[PDB]
């Protein structure tokens, strides 16, 4: 039958309801005026319940602006309200319907994208929807202005072009910006094993260049680390890529150890017999970072399971990894130095005995042999992981902290361990205990600040002051930053390069005392 | 709307009446009564497409922004330099009293009149004259009219005094006898808990002129009735002022200490040493 008796009431519900005149009112009005009936009382129903809420808002908003309160507060409030209403009421089906009625969203989308909050709205909408056509198109096009990983790896050509551009940005990032340039690439590579194997093979071929391919090898190892973080075993990848195929025993042994993310006396015994043979396989073959981290957590956490008949075998293989010089005569190991092996293994043995004994005062007893033996780099890493796991226990500072002293030997005597030590203390500078009160927390924080100032004195100055700026802008109270400046200007000698001033002085703007601060600011601005 | 130079519904129908292009006139009225931000004139069609009319986000921001306007009325009462803050509140008063007739800006202006010690009394006169304002007016608005003229004070204390005598007569004539209790068991502070005298204290607040006014009303009715009820209501009003710790009456009234002593006397029903 005729839908007039129902559709006219459907429209009149939206006419005679409180306050609907301002709208789909046109569509329903057309459905009614074509359906006949009483169109004169329709307009009266639209304007009867017109409460004039809009002019009420005019009065109220202009009165808030009369009050001297910032109108940008009103802008933020209205934007937050409407954006939250959108997110609560967003329908992916209707976004795809906007796509269906036309492929490119009309100018309302291109006007919203000018607003940063609406761009973030589209990011949160489309980062979770890898099949909604509107959302996928918006995220991909805004990347052309996150590139969604599903459309990043949907074909070779897109993956390759975004890969090479992102890798160019990583290489441009030097040694700091990779933290932001690598994940967008890495999470793009870490979605499938085929995009994975392709990117790893490309980086392997790129790594053969002696004009910086070492860095591409580094980034490939980092991407493999991330692929492990996504729970995907790239063991056989590194095997068939590297020289594992040159030695099947080392191949199966190492690859099994990497696939588990743990060691074992069996594969370790295989490598021990191989390197005890007259033809030891390449030391590069075992020099893999996660593998050596397995050595660390076997030898320096409490436990693990261990036999004495294999304890020395683990130790000797790690010594061979950390000691032996193989010179390539066109990829030919012809000279094998094993003369700095036995001392390294002896130091590793003694230090691992101490560390797995769960030492404090006994450390100070044999600190002589320790600082004698931290000169070995691998031993320094091992003690670093041991003291990390001891000190990372919740409330390890209420009971002896001598351990923080040992970094002084490490970082001072080993330059490349500056990034680890600071990147250890960034956790320890955020220590918080309800037992050890905020006074003691600030005491430990200031101790760690003195450690970080010393590490700055060794040249690790850009990331120290950058993180100090970040945590002041965040966490770190003004007292801690003032104490930082106190110790710094008490220890650092002029001249002060502008690479250090550019971050140290514009955060020192908060304070003017520790007077040495006045001298520093005057010298560094003049 | 015309009080500050904006149109009303009759002007809208004029804009529609006898027009060859009513639709464009309607659109012009809509433009001339919208919220004037440049992001909205594009977003209004887009949000309209959702099934959400423009008035709906207007309602949300309406609630938000008058909540903040009332917050800032209280703030400017308590914030800013004195001359500037009172100038701001009086100017905002002149802006807002044109819409006290509307259902939005009554209590806002009532707070503004609450926080100013004196006002041009035209608006207080309208507050007493109109029953809606007579209800919703803040307590200091009512105080300022009473402090400027005793008409409304007499007009509202007469029914309240009548109700107090109604309570006295009804309680004195009640037919219950027991070993358990009687009607003289409540102490004077027990009897002050009724909303009659507590509301009378709210009507007086901390003002001494209204204290004299209630004193003279109770005096006249006590001189005509020869009944102790109005005396009891004076005592209850004074000790209700003391229950609020009203220093404006308690410290200056020589009778306050003596009535406070008498309160404990009545509480034990004896005058101990």
UniProtKB/Swiss-Prot annotation, chain A:
Phenotype when changing residue 375 to Q: Reduces RNA binding
GO biological process: negative regulation of transcription elongation by RNA polymerase II
GO cellular component: membrane; NELF complex; nucleoplasm; nucleus
Pfam families the UniProt entry points to: TH1
Protein family membership: Belongs to the NELF-D family.
Subunit structure comment from the entry: The NELF complex is composed of NELFA, NELFB, NELFCD (isoform NELF-C or isoform NELF-D) and NELFE; NELFA and NELFCD form a stable subcomplex that binds primarily through NELFCD to the N-terminus of NELFB. Binds RNA which may help to stabilize the NELF complex on nucleic acid. In vitro, the NELFA:NELFCD subcomplex binds to ssDNA and ssRNA in a sequence- and structure-dependent manner. Interacts with ARAF. Interacts with PCF11. Interacts with KAT8.
Protein name, per record: Negative elongation factor C/D
Native source species: Homo sapiens (Human)
Gene: NELFCD
Curated annotation (Swiss-Prot), chain B:
UniProt tissue specificity: Widely expressed. Expressed in heart, brain, lung, placenta, liver, skeletal muscle, kidney and pancreas.
Highest rank taxon of the organism: Eukaryota
Localization, UniProt: Nucleus
Signal peptide: none
Coiled-coil positions: none
Protein's job: Essential component of the NELF complex, a complex that negatively regulates the elongation of transcription by RNA polymerase II. The NELF complex, which acts via an association with the DSIF complex and causes transcriptional pausing, is counteracted by the P-TEFb kinase complex. May be able to induce chromatin unfolding. Essential for early embryogenesis; plays an important role in maintaining the undifferentiated state of embryonic stem cells (ESCs) by preventing unscheduled expression of developmental genes. (Microbial infection) The NELF complex is involved in HIV-1 latency possibly involving recruitment of PCF11 to paused RNA polymerase II. In vitro, binds weakly to the HIV-1 TAR RNA which is located in the long terminal repeat (LTR) of HIV-1.
Family indicated by similarity: Belongs to the NELF-B family.
Known partners and oligomeric status: The NELF complex is composed of NELFA, NELFB, NELFCD (isoform NELF-C or isoform NELF-D) and NELFE; the N-terminus of NELFB binds to the NELFA:NELFCD subcomplex. Binds RNA which may help to stabilize the NELF complex on nucleic acid. Interacts with the first BRCT repeat of BRCA1. Interacts with KIAA1191. Interacts with NELFE.
Full protein name: Negative elongation factor B
Gene: NELFB
Shown residues within the full chain: 5 to 277 of 580
